[PDB]
């Protein structure tokens, strides 16, 4: 009856999904899966960049989020991600100079352009937030989701499944150390194992 309250994910997640994998679809439960993973990543990185880094009440900066992602993401993955972050910075510069701007969100591939202001500002570490930081978050979460989702879709094709299943996400995360170390700390459906390797007597 009543309209929704939480952070908008559905379309944006299935948005850009086809370009990641056109043949492959999603499970609604897996969609909520990825949704809360995304908002968790937003919470953690927002908390880092905001609550931790700027001394005093200083504005939260795009560069702040940049560094936050760089540390939070893996060495190589963080390095690649931050370059992509600056790429998104340039893209949104082109957006803002454009009159069209964010009305069609100007290639801001995920709805993250909309969820970013939320995850930062109402994280309430401070009140003082640059929009560039929001674009940085959008890019960071969007790259992370793109990589994990692509791995998941590849797993689904490996399982020959039209729509993704949560086990595919599980396998993807446990497969990549980089993503796991970021988000595998969390809990989710099923056992949630790490699948320790080399079952050999030490």
């Amino acid at each position: 009856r009543k309209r929704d309250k939480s952070v908008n994910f559905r379309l944006g997640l299935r948005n850009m999904l086809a370009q990641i994998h056109p043949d492959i679809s999603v499970q609604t439960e897996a969609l909520s899966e990825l949704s809360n993973i995304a908002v968790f990543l937003g919470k953690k990185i927002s908390h880092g960049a905001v609550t931790l880094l700027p001394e005093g009440t200083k504005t939260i900066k795009s560069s702040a989020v940049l560094l936050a992602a760089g540390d939070l993401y893996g060495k190589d993955l963080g390095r690649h991600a931050v370059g992509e972050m600056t790429k998104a910075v340039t893209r949104y510069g082109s957006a803002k100079e454009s009159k069209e701007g964010s009305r069609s969100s100007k290639a801001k591939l995920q709805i993250s352009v909309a969820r970013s202001e939320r995850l930062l500002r109402e994280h309430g570490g401070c009140s003082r937030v640059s929009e560039g930081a929001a674009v940085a978050l959008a890019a960071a979460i969007e790259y992370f989701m793109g990589e994990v989702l692509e791995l998941a879709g590849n797993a689904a094709r490996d399982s020959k499944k039209v729509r993704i299943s949560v086990k595919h996400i599980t396998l993807a995360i446990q497969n990549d150390a980089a993503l796991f170390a970021v988000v595998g700390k969390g809990v989710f459906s099923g056992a949630g194992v790490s699948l320790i390797s080399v079952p050999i007597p030490r």
Partner: protein
Amino acid sequence: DHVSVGETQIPKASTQHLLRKAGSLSAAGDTEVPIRGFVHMKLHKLVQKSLLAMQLAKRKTIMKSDVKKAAELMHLPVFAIPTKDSGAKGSVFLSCRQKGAGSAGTGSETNSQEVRSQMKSTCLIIPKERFRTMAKEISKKEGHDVHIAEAALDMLQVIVESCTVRLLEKALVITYSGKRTRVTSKDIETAFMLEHG
């Protein structure tokens, strides 16, 4: 030691089911009392947090958001289904452990079927209403006896089961470092000792 043991504890078969789910190849006959104890312990901590939360809320029943904020207070990144979550039945059967098709009992790991079949199960493994009985009973013994939402209850299911699986995984790591196959209870207490101590 230090194993809280209440007066209602989910059957031991469920415990070894959890064990093999985590990939425990074999467990000592004493491995099961402690794991019951510490699953009770995690449950108790979580329910205390959530219930004091709702008590602050001037509330009379636990809902999903309650245990949600409680768990992330426990510092666990948490979320579960509000519409249709995985239940219990739903699972790979116990008597279909035999394999006429692709016979089990070969080595590498020897069983090779039970563990795979049970791990490939989305469903929650602990019977729902036995767990519900624990929830109500603990809300008796400390909780001021309030109502429970099955949605919050089941997300609690997933939180506690996955957490204890992580525990058992650490325990298996311990055992292999101890260079032996079967897991002992002592292994589990050592795991928890490392976990908080």
